[PDB]
């Protein structure tokens with residue numbers, strides 16, 4: 001009986017194995033745009049993905065992960081609220097069964113069709129496993145997806161999903177450029193939070209871009225053809241793999257923009 005997104009193992013059950021689910025800095029959250037305050041102390045955000053080296057794409061039974069070589073500083077996030085250098089390790093998405101749901105963060109209670117998480121770790125801690133044990137160990141760049149025009153830089157991902165339909169399947173995925181998944185604007189909201197999946201560790205500086213990217217109906221439909229189950233098991237479509245908004249508690253969301 002492991003964790004997932006169903007009635008019997010979903011978000012409302014996670015706290016039994018992972019008591020930090022009811023912690024003081026859980027993610028995601030609703031971003032109330034009128035309560036978020038512009039912060040002049042924020043430095044410019046630097047997304048440096050030119051040298052990124054993708055390796056593989058994996059269906060882990062919860063989402064698909066595009067993994068990167070993070071054995072040197074090649075694709076890095078710095079600036080904004082961050083002190084130091086954070087290395088890109090992987091990205092993945094959360095999405096819905098319908099276009100009106102799928103994001104984890106919400107904006108004035110609005111749910112987007114999906115949300116992209118680019119996961120980075122603070123190089124001062126030497127490895128990802130050490131980083132997740134620290135309050136400032138990770139920086140996750142969150143980008144909302146809405147349905148409209150196709151995102152050309154997403155299509156290479158979309159076209160490999162056939163090869164990784166079921167839990168445990170992986171495919172080589174070299175030379176993928178994550179720059180093609182970014183919107184024009186780097187305007188963002190930031191707050192201290194957590195991983196939104198077990199182990200729900202309170203180790204993340206969240207940076208959520210205000211500008212969504214647009215993807216086509218056909219693109220998101222292909223996400224929805226993935227499977228939570230393993231090969232030769234009854235088919236359970238990989239949809240609605242999002243955690244809902246959690247209590248903000250003693251936190252302020254800061255805006256990079258006026």
Ligand SMILES: [N]S(=O)(=O)[N][C]C1234B567B89%10B%11%12%13B85%14B%1158B%12%11%15B%139%12B%1061B%12%112C5%153B%14874
Pocket residue numbers: 117119140194195196197198199
């Ligand atoms: N939505 S999230 O990025 O907070 N958490 C997803 C994951 B998957 B697995 B590792 B990988 B890295 B860590 B565990 B799980 B946690 C981050 B990725």
Ligand SMILES: [Zn+2]
Pocket residue numbers: 092093094117196
């Ligand atoms: Zn995520």
